[PDB]
Amino acid sequence: RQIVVGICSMAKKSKSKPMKEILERISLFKYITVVVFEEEVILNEPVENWPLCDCLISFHSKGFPLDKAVAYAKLRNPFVINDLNMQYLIQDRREVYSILQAEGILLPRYAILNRDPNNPKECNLIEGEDHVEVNGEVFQKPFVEKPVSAEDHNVYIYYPTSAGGGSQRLFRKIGSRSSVYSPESNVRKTGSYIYEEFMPTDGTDVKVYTVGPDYAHAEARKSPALDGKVERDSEGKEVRYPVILNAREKLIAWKVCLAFKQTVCGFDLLRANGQSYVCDVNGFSFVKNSMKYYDDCAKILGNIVMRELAPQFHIPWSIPLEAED
Numbered sequence: 001r002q003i004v005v006g007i008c009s010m011a012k013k014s015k016s017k018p019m020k021e022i023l024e025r026i027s028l029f030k031y032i033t034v035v036v037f038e039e040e041v042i043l044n045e046p047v048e049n050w051p052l053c054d055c056l057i058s059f060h061s062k063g064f065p066l067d068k069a070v071a072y073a074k075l076r077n078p079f080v081i082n083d084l085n086m087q088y089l090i091q092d093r094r095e096v097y098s099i100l101q102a103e104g105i106l107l108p109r110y111a112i113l114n115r116d117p118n119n120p121k122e123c124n125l126i127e128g129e130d131h132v133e134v135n136g137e138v139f140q141k142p143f144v145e146k147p148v149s150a151e152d153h154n155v156y157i158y159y160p161t162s163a164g165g166g167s168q169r170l171f172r173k174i175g176s177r178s179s180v181y182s183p184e185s186n187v188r189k190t191g192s193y194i195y196e197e198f199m200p201t202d203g204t205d206v207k208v209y210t211v212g213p214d215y216a217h218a219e220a221r222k223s224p225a226l227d228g229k230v231e232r233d234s235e236g237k238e239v240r241y242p243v244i245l246n247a248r249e250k251l252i253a254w255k256v257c258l259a260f261k262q263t264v265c266g267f268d269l270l271r272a273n274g275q276s277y278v279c280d281v282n283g284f285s286f287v288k289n290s291m292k293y294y295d296d297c298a299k300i301l302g303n304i305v306m307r308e309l310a311p312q313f314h315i316p317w318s319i320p321l322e323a324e325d
C-alpha cells in the first residue's frame, strides 16, 4: 500500500499557496499519498474519527487545537515531522530563549519580567528615563520589550534621549505598515515581558527557513523597527533581499532544527557586531514565492518519509544527495 502523509493544520495554512505548491510536489513521489485533514474535522470531530496516516505533518497556529493533535499522535503513533509537544513551548518566548541558551546559541542579553495581574506594581522593575532595571539587571536605551506570548506581536523598542526618546511600536503587518512611532517613553505597565538589548544591524533582519537540519534557505527584509513602512514590489509582495548563510549560521540552523525538533522551522537572525544572534524561533514556516524552495522542500520531505518508512512497507530506497541551500 501507499505511504500516507497526513497534513493537520488550520485551513488558512493548509490551503495557503506555499502549502499547495509543496503538497503537489510531494504527491509526485510514487509511493506517497497526501491526505489534508479538513478544518471542520480537526475542530469538530473526535480524534478517533480523523483520517489515518503513517507520517504526520501538523503544526499550531492561531485557533488550532494542539491538545487534539497530541492525542491523535498518541492514538495512532505516526512518524511525526514537527514534534507536537515542543509546539507548546514555541508559544512562550521565555521557553524559546531558555532552549537557545542551553544549546550555546548566541542571543541578545535579556531579562524576564513576570507580573502577577493582581499585584502589578510588586514586580522587579525600576524605570529611569534612559534605562530600565529588571531583576536588578540594567538595560540602557535602546532596548526591546517583547510580550512573553510568542503569538503577541506587539513588540516595542524604546529610544534613548540622545535620539529623541519615544518608542517604536511593532505589530502584524496591516497593509503598508509594520510599525509606528509613539512619543511614549515609559514602558508598558501591565503584562509580562522580556526585556533585551537592542542589536545594531544594517537595518535588515535575516529570516531562515529550515527543512531538516542540513538545509536552510535564508532571505533578508527591511527591519520593521526602522520606520515601519513596508517595501512592496510592483507585484504587491514584500521586498526580500538575497542572503547566503556563513558556516556559523548554517550551524545555528542545524542546532535550532534539532533542539526544537521541528523539521520545518523558521527563525530570525540579527547580523550585528560581526556575529549572528537568534531573536525569534517560529516553528513551522514555508518560504513564499520561491519555486526552487518549493522543489527542494518537497524533495527533502519526501526523502525523509521514504528514509524512515520504506523498509516497513518493503519499498526499495537508496538515500539520495540533497542541497544545503
Ligand SMILES: O=P(O)(O)O[C@H]1[C@@H](OP(=O)(O)O)[C@H](OP(=O)(O)O)[C@@H](OP(=O)(O)OP(=O)(O)O)[C@H](OP(=O)(O)O)[C@H]1OP(=O)(O)O
Pocket: 061, 062, 172, 173, 175, 207, 237, 238, 266, 282, 284, 285, 286, 288
Ligand atoms: O510563518 P507563517 O507562514 O505562519 O506566516 C506568518 C508570518 O511569517 P513569520 O512567522 O516568519 O513572521 C507572515 O509574515 P511574512 O513572512 O509573510 O512577511 C505573516 O504574513 P503577513 O503579515 O500577512 O505578511 P504579508 O503577506 O502582508 O506581506 C503571517 O500573517 P497572516 O497570514 O496575516 O496570519 C503569519 O501568520 P500568523 O503568525 O498566523 O499571523
Ligand SMILES: Nc1ncnc2c1ncn2[C@@H]1O[C@H](COP(=O)(O)OP(=O)(O)NP(=O)(O)O)[C@@H](O)[C@H]1O
Pocket: 108, 144, 146, 150, 152, 153, 154, 155, 170, 196, 197, 198, 199, 200, 204, 205, 223, 224, 225, 268, 270, 279, 280, 282
Ligand atoms: N534584540 C533586538 N535587537 C534589534 N532588533 C530586534 C531585537 N529583537 C527583535 N528585533 C526586531 O523586531 C522585530 C520583531 O521581533 P520578533 O522577536 O521577531 O517578534 P515576533 O513578534 O515574534 N515577529 P514574527 O517573526 O512575525 O514571529 C524583529 O524582526 C527585529 O527586526
Ligand SMILES: [Mg+2]
Pocket: 026, 027, 028, 029, 030, 031, 032, 033
Ligand atoms: Mg504519489
Ligand SMILES: [Mg+2]
Pocket: 060, 061, 282, 283, 284
Ligand atoms: Mg506560527
Ligand SMILES: [Mg+2]
Pocket: 173
Ligand atoms: Mg497578514
Ligand SMILES: [Mg+2]
Pocket: 268, 279, 280
Ligand atoms: Mg520574528
Ligand SMILES: [Mg+2]
Pocket: 150, 280, 281, 282
Ligand atoms: Mg515570532
